[PDB]
Design a protein around this ligand. Structure first.
Ligand code: EGY
Ligand code: EGY
Ligand code: EGY
Ligand code: EGY
Ligand code: KZB
Ligand code: KZB
Ligand code: KZB
Ligand code: KZB
Ligand code: KZB
Ligand code: KZE
Ligand code: MG
Lengths: 33, 108, 46, 76, 656, 110
């Protein structure tokens, strides 16, 4: 199937990318026309 | 109370509550042992007082810094204010992480 | 009126699934007619 | 996205909509006109222009400006 | 290419929410990835069996259903003894998945229902927090509630418990109530009423919910912000919620008669009086106005939450469970790593800009925090509030410092603060992943040792295939649903604990000598007895560490006056299983059981033969004979032992 | 001793109220009177069919509350407390909530 050490790495990468994207969104929202 | 006294009461309540007061009352622990070596859910009175202090001080550092941003403030005093806030927050975070590591080995 | 009469009929014979289905249909129809009528009423009021 | 189902229609909120539609149209037209002018000036005036393709581009730009003026008068 | 501000904003929101939902569903399934997918912790086996019934018999047969396979001497009516929301949800999803041929067994739907609802919870939290303030806080709160460890602990793939869906129901009801307070419309209040009805049917915490809306309304009254919107919303919610909650069968007349639903009635009457007085204060001049100027008590599982001393000091069956003690700060930090450091900032933002919906979120936070401090099991309802507030907190800081930047339209302090905050968020993600992986995902049916020994399942399968169709087995209340779901035989006690006299009877049978206990077993018509031993495997949670609780529960009700729990200790007050043990403990029926032929089995290297791993001792009675019991079966590692109760002596002899 | 104020207030109420609001108040008085007679009967004979008493009674209380809420939303003196709840939308919400309540009351009575 899928070994754990793969699922954990996937979850870590996805979460870090998610939070960084959310932080970016805050920048984009502050600078509105 | 003007919505500030109530906030002070809530902060005091939060600190005390996160100190495991109900735990102490219901299950009486001795003041200082001999951090439980292997028991995650284990509360001595001193360790809990110290930790809840860390949590409350971190919140205080956030609000203390967040306030610093206000305009028309003298720079000599604002620099000191900013310093205090950064110190409090970083110390609270790193300390709490270290404490949890020491109490629960194998962390991460 | 048909919806309220159905509500009465449900009490004597129909169970809840059948009554709920019938109510779904009749309520959709009444909603369409009521939307049209209330739009007309709002125009006439102003 | 085709069903309104609204009873009391607010024309004040519809005026903003019929302004947003127009300003999008005008922004598209103006950006396209600037791009067309720059592209014509860069592809027809390298070393020889003969004032024929440049004249056609000027006529097209005048027609585009006239259409934009009509749209601006309509939105005004 | 270039895009509009609205297009890029919408794309960003959509992408963030999609990633958050996918992560929420992905993080939940660690146990399914490891061990084979099976319902675990033996609490949800009852829910699982119930769901299967609803999926293969219908609803009308399920609404009025009498179960004769549990609490054999008495009768158990499953159709009206439990809140039916989870089973209905699972059966509806199953029938929808079967209409379009996507045929999936009931077990797979039950296993993966909790991750799906945990994925829905993220979107609901985003909308709830968007109502509070700027959407950025909503995205942040959604992302943070995705990975929170408490919520992921109480809802894992393979855990079919009602709390999972319950939390989503509660958040939906809170969103509807906030929208009704802000909008002040009857339609939103009716939506809130329907959502509250769904919540009543799904979880037993509806009482909780119906004591936070009225308290908030009362808090709003004291402040003086009361308006017609709050009146309309609360009254409309109250009538419909009261009625809709009535017709849940298990509830009955609980809301109008009981004492947990009296705060709502009081606030309703006070609201009517206040509105009428305010209306009368306008039509008359000030001088004229100044001239004019049988019920049940607390049930007990709710009372102990208010007074955390009653259940531990008086009732020996509620405090017997493990997760009923107060929570410590270490547990608070373990569940929430960075959420705790942001609760005060969220409370400060709320207290700084007081609105008509902020007061409600503050009240929710405070009361829920207290309840989490008075019980471990109620940490759950604390995770959802925290995220919201924490989200707000973090969001605000970002929005405060991403405007000072020069690139946005000393200054570098803001950049340093942004970097610091990003570090906090990523370390919270890593902490949540580790806590989910290494602590919370675990099976209770299989003992993880990589070698696994599933003695429980093997014993249940033997009991299923090699006993008569009417054999009755008696065990402790813990292993009640598990036997019926797997062993599939008539049981005597169960994990409901709705008749303490029956459980006390079984405790007396397990804690007395062979003569009296044989009399009890003959009276109850029991055939096989299943006792977990775990002496060879080293299992801490065996059926010998619960013996003390058996004695306490059994020697309480009007017939165990001869049990006398202080008779099983040593003279100095110890509880040893060796020779120095009490001469009544070493002759107890429980001791004759689970120690038969255990005197001559080596279990260590440098240790004497009759050794017990869990107690680290030396059996007091090495050899004894069972007069009234035959050994029917014993698993490979001596973890589960099944004994067949004997008959009367043919020639009518004594057979003590 | 407290009759003059009542006379004044009753006189005033009529002048500052339109036709629709007076009509609605008549309907509301009817609801209140039916509920009071029902509750009095219950206090007179007792409650063997308790669920039927609850159903029939909370039907009255719910209709009373929906009438009061409709009255509040319609009255233009509160036009500043809703901002989007037009009279027609108010009547629509009234009908929706009333249908739900009547359905549940029927599903609860014997
Ligand atoms: C066992 C568990 C028990 C749970 C207890 C729940 C505790 C609730 C926590 C407190 C809730 C805070 C509510 C709140 O924010 O009210 C504040 C401050 O004003 C006040 O609130 C003063 C009234 C104090 C009542 C607080 C709740 C008491 C409810 C008991 C029924 C409003 O201040 P005000 O000054 O009243 O209004 C604002 C006016 N300004 C000009 C100042 C802006
Ligand atoms: C997708 C998941 C949605 C979950 C919704 C949760 C619903 C909880 C159900 C609780 C069950 C309560 C039992 C009950 O309602 O009684 C049943 C009536 O039986 C029924 O009709 C059950 C249908 C319930 C649907 C009602 C709307 C729920 C909407 C919630 C969002 C009686 O059915 P009947 O036998 O028809 O009784 C009628 C007989 N008379 C003569 C009196 C008319
Ligand atoms: C269980 C079945 C119950 C049957 C209910 C019977 C309904 C009676 C019909 C009365 C007429 C309703 C009028 C109506 O539809 O209003 C609808 C919003 O609609 C409502 O406010 C309530 C109508 C609820 C009816 C639901 C049936 C929908 C079926 C459609 C297939 C829209 O209101 P608006 O005020 O126009 O909302 C627009 C707001 N903007 C700011 C965007 C402009
Ligand atoms: C809203 C209305 C629609 C509702 C839709 C409900 C969606 C339900 C999602 C659950 C899907 C179930 C998938 C599944 O059952 O996988 C499990 C275990 O195998 C796995 O490894 C699966 C783990 C991760 C797969 C998750 C995919 C789910 C995607 C859903 C969007 C299989 O368990 P087993 O019983 O072991 O199957 C093996 C049997 N064989 C003989 C075939 C070998
Ligand atoms: C538009 C209006 C039309 C009139 C009405 O409201 C909506 O719609 C009627 C239905 O047709 C009902 C009958 C159905 C057949 C049913 C046969 C049983 O046998 C009998 O017992 C009851 C009976 C006759 C129902 C009685 C109520 C009726 C007449 C309802 C009225 C209230
Ligand atoms: C104008 C409206 C008035 C209300 C209604 O529509 C037209 O007129 C009713 C009919 O009387 C229908 C019943 C007929 C007998 C039939 C017996 C079966 O046995 C039973 O299963 C279904 C049942 C009762 C029908 C159900 C739908 C009814 C109630 C219909 C309503 C929706
Ligand atoms: C979202 C899309 C897909 C889902 C759907 O709407 C649109 O909503 C479904 C309902 O849940 C319906 C089922 C209910 C249970 C009922 C059991 C009976 O047994 C069986 O005969 C009919 C059955 C399965 C219903 C069939 C139609 C369904 C699947 C409806 C679809 C059209
Ligand atoms: C089985 C699944 C089904 C889907 C779901 O999980 C379980 O259960 C859904 C709920 O039903 C939620 C919705 C409630 C209604 C709410 C209305 C708002 O509409 C506003 O629209 C403005 C512009 O016109 C107006 O001005 C405002 O007045 C008006 O409130 C909308 O923004 C959010 C929305 C749709 C909720 C979103 C999350 C949903 C879909 C939840 C999912 C997670
Ligand atoms: C949303 C709504 C929900 C419902 C409600 O408001 C909010 O909340 C309900 C309360 O629970 C009230 C009941 C309390 C118990 C009380 C017992 C009496 O018992 C009498 O029995 C006689 C026999 O002879 C003797 O003569 C009498 O002396 C003896 O008092 C009974 O009559 C009235 C009853 C049932 C109350 C009625 C009003 C109720 C239902 C209230 C509603 C208004
Ligand atoms: C002050 C005052 C007097 C009243 C207001 C207090 C407030 C806010 C609420 C009422 C407090 C109360 C009784 C219970 C709190 C309810 C909570 C936290 C959780 C639900 C209760 C548990 C036992 C259900 C799960 O158990 P099960 O599902 O059944 O296993
Ligand atoms: Mg439970």
């Amino acid at each position: 199937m899928i070994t754990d050490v793969q699922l954990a790495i996937f979850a870590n990468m996805l979460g870090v990318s998610l939070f960084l994207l959310v932080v970016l969104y805050h920048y984009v929202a502050v600078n509105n026309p | 109370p003007s919505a500030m006294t109530v906030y002070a009461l809530v902060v005091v309540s939060y600190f005390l509550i996160t100190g495991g007061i109900i735990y102490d009352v219901i299950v009486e622990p001795p003041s200082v042992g001999s951090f439980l070596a292997y028991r995650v859910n284990g509360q001595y009175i001193m360790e809990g007082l110290a930790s809840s202090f860390l949590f409350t001080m971190g919140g205080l550092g956030f609000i203390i810094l967040d306030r610093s941003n206000a305009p028309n403030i003298p720079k000599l005093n604002r620099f000191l204010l900013l310093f205090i806030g950064f110190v409090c927050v970083l110390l609270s975070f790193f300390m709490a992480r270290v404490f949890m590591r020491m109490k629960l080995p194998g962390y991460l | 009126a048909a919806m309220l009469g159905l509500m009465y009929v449900y009490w004597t014979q129909l169970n809840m699934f059948q009554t709920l289905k019938y109510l779904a249909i009749l309520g959709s129809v009444t909603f369409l007619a009521g939307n049209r009528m209330l739009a007309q009423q709002a125009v006439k009021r102003t | 996205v085709r069903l309104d189902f609204s009873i009391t229609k607010d024309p004040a909120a519809e005026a903003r909509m019929k302004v947003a539609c127009i300003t999008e149209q005008v922004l598209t037209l103006v950006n396209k006109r600037i791009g067309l002018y720059r592209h014509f000036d860069e592809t027809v005036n390298r070393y020889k222009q003969s004032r024929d393709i440049s004249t056609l581009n000027s006529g097209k730009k005048s027609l585009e400006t006239e259409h934009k003026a009509l749209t601006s008068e309509i939105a005004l | 290419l270039r895009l509009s501000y609205e297009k890029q904003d919408t794309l960003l929101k959509l992408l963030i929410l999609s990633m958050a939902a996918v992560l929420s569903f992905s993080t939940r399934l660690f146990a399914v990835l490891r061990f084979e997918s099976v319902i675990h912790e033996f609490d949800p086996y009852f829910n699982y069996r119930t769901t299967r019934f609803l999926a293969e018999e219908g609803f009308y047969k399920f609404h009025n259903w009498f179960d004769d396979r549990a609490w054999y001497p008495l009768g158990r009516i499953i159709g009206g003894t439990i809140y039916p929301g989870l089973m209905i949800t699972s059966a509806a999803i199953y029938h929808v998945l079967h209409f379009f041929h996507i045929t999936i067994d009931i077990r797979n739907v039950c296993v993966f229902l909790a991750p799906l609802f945990s994925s829905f919870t993220t979107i609901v939290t985003y909308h709830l927090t968007k109502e509070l303030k700027d959407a950025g806080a909503g995205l942040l709160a959604a992302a943070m509630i995705a990975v929170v460890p408490g919520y992921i602990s109480r809802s894992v793939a393979g855990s079919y418990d009602n709390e999972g869906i319950a939390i989503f129901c509660m958040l939906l009801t809170y969103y509807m109530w906030i929208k009704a307070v802000k909008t002040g419309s009857i339609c939103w209040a009716a939506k809130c009423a329907l959502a509250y009805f769904y919540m009543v049917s799904s979880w037993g915490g509806y009482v909780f919910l119906i004591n936070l809306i009225p308290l908030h309304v009362l808090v709003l009254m004291l402040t003086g912000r009361f308006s017609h919107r709050i009146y309309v919303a609360y009254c409309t919610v109250y009538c419909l919620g009261t009625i809709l909650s009535m017709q849940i069968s298990f509830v009955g007349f609980q809301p109008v008669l009981s004492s947990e639903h009296m705060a709502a009635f009081g606030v309703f009457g006070l609201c009517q009086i206040h509105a009428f007085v305010d209306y009368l204060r306008s039509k008359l001049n000030p001088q004229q106005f100044e001239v004019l100027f049988k019920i049940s008590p607390w049930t007990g599982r709710f009372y102990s939450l208010l007074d955390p001393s009653y259940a531990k000091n008086n009732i020996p069956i509620i405090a017997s469970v493990s997760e009923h003690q107060p929570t410590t700060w270490s547990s608070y930090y373990f569940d929430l790593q960075l959420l705790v450091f942001m609760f005060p900032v969220g409370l400060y933002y709320c207290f700084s800009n007081l609105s008509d919906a902020r007061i409600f979120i503050i009240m929710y936070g405070v009361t829920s925090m207290y309840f989490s401090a008075v019980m471990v099991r109620l940490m759950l309802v604390l995770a959802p509030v925290m995220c919201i507030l924490s989200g707000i907190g973090v969001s605000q800081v970002l929005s405060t410092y991403m405007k000072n930047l020069d690139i946005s339209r000393k200054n570098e302090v803001a950049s340093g603060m942004i970097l610091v905050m990003a570090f906090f968020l990523i370390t919270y993600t890593f902490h949540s992943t580790w806590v989910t992986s290494e602590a919370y995902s675990s099976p209770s049916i299989v003992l993880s040792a990589r070698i696994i020994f599933d003695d429980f399942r093997e014993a249940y399968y033997w009991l299923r295939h090699n006993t008569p169709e009417d054999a009755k087995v008696m065990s402790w209340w813990d292993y009640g649903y598990q036997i019926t779901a797997m062993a599939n035989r008539t049981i005597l006690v169960d994990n409901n604990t709705w008749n303490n006299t029956h459980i006390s009877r079984v405790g007396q049978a397990m804690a007395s000598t062979e003569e009296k206990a044989y009399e009890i077993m003959r009276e109850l018509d029991v055939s096989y007895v299943l006792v977990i031993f775990g002496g060879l495997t080293g299992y801490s949670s065996d059926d010998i560490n619960k013996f003390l609780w058996m004695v306490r529960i059994g020697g309480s009700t009007d017939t165990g006056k001869h049990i006398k729990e202080n008779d099983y200790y040593t003279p100095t007050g110890e509880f040893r299983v060796d020779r120095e043990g009490s001469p009544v403990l070493l002759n107890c029926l429980m001791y004759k059981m689970c120690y038969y032929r255990f005197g001559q089995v080596y279990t260590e290297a440098k240790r004497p033969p009759g050794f017990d791993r869990v107690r680290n001792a030396e059996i007091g009675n090495k050899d004894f004979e069972l007069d009234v019991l035959e050994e029917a079966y014993t698993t490979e590692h001596w973890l589960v032992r099944i004994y067949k109760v004997k008959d009367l002596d043919n020639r009518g002899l004594s057979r003590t | 001793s407290v009759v003059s104020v009542i006379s004044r207030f009753l006189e005033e109420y009529l002048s500052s109220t339109p036709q629709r609001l007076k009509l609605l108040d008549a309907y509301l008085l009817y609801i209140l009177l039916t509920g009071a007679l029902q509750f009095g009967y219950c206090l007179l004979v007792g409650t063997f069919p308790f669920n039927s008493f609850l159903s029939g009674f909370i039907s009255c209380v719910g209709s009373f509350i929906l009438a009061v809420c409709l009255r509040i939303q319609i009255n233009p003196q509160n036009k500043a407390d809703f901002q989007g709840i037009s009279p027609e939308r108010a009547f629509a919400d009234f009908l929706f909530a009333s249908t739900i309540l009547h359905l549940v009351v029927m599903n609860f009575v014997g």
